[PDB]
Design a protein around this ligand. Sequence first.
Ligand SMILES: CCCN1CCC(N(Cc2ccc3c(c2)OCO3)C(=O)Nc2cccc(C(F)(F)F)c2)CC1
Length: 366
Amino acid sequence: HSQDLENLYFQGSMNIFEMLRIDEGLRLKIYKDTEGYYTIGIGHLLTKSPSLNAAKSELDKAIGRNTNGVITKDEAEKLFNQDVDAAVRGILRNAKLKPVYDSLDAVRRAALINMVFQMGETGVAGFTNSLRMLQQKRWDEAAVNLAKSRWYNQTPNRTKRVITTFRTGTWDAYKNLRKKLEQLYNRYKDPQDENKIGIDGIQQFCDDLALDPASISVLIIAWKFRAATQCEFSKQEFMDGMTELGCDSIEKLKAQIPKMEQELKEPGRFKDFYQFTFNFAKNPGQKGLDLEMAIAYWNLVLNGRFKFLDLWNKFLLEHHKRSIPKDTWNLLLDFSTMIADDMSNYDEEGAWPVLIDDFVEFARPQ
Ligand SMILES: CCCN1CCC(N(Cc2ccc3c(c2)OCO3)C(=O)Nc2cccc(C(F)(F)F)c2)CC1
């Protein structure tokens, strides 16, 4: 009962959790962070173990049920609140942070905690001049000074909101952000289902971004938004992606697209994108991907990368209808990577899909 959120009902509805939900984002399924470690919620590290089962054990232990690696928002808030309590304890025994923290009102304390989550105690303690201004209630001067920092350059939109919070002592920046995202989402949402954007809204989104829906850039955007399926774009996907990408407008999203595209050059990221495509393309009711749909997506994602793509098309157009399983999809990229220009190094004993064995027999003589 100690962690029950009902114990916080005397607070405002806006709080540090909701603040970090906007500034960092909330994930309700176990995922791997930057450094490859299993994480959930708002940046809550579960374990450094490579074992997902280990991560699930820790999570189940913490939540008190068999989660299967999926939690609710309220469960994420409980984890986050533990983390906040630890951050506050640290602040309160730090001679450079305690005096300013103690001096601040509740809303501005949240802004300081936000900073500590982003940059750690040492990072925040480096702002000696600005912290002194805050301790002295010189809010406008503190705001001006913080805006000159590398922090501002690293995360300008988050930093601006945190600074506004210090300037005003209100949640205005966060109310405004939420409203801006709601109003933007409302431009695209399905009028018959407010939980998602349908085909017409996706088209409008593409048009607003000046992109052809058939372009690889649109698939890259879906990948960055971790979209579940090609047929719709959920409210949760839209909000989570805009949050993760640090964007509260179409202009900002447009400026981010080239950066998304560049990520495909970093280690493992093209493979991640390629594998994502299968799940996105497949009918949610089906386990495999219809061959015709697989061809369409292969032609988008592998053109200019897979030197045998045209022969692959010729091969498949002769083939009978089948569901392409995930493993066959995934292994085609590995085939593309290893295969010699004349196919002379294919290992028939490599446990490739039969489809690829058959392709090599078809192609070697062409
Ligand atoms: C070779 C693969 C081509 N590809 C297939 C999927 C098409 N499509 C759904 C869509 C988008 C626009 C359409 C349409 C269907 O029919 C008419 O106009 C989507 O990408 N949907 C989508 C779903 C969630 C998020 C997003 C995204 F974030 F905008 F990128 C797009 C876009 C074109």
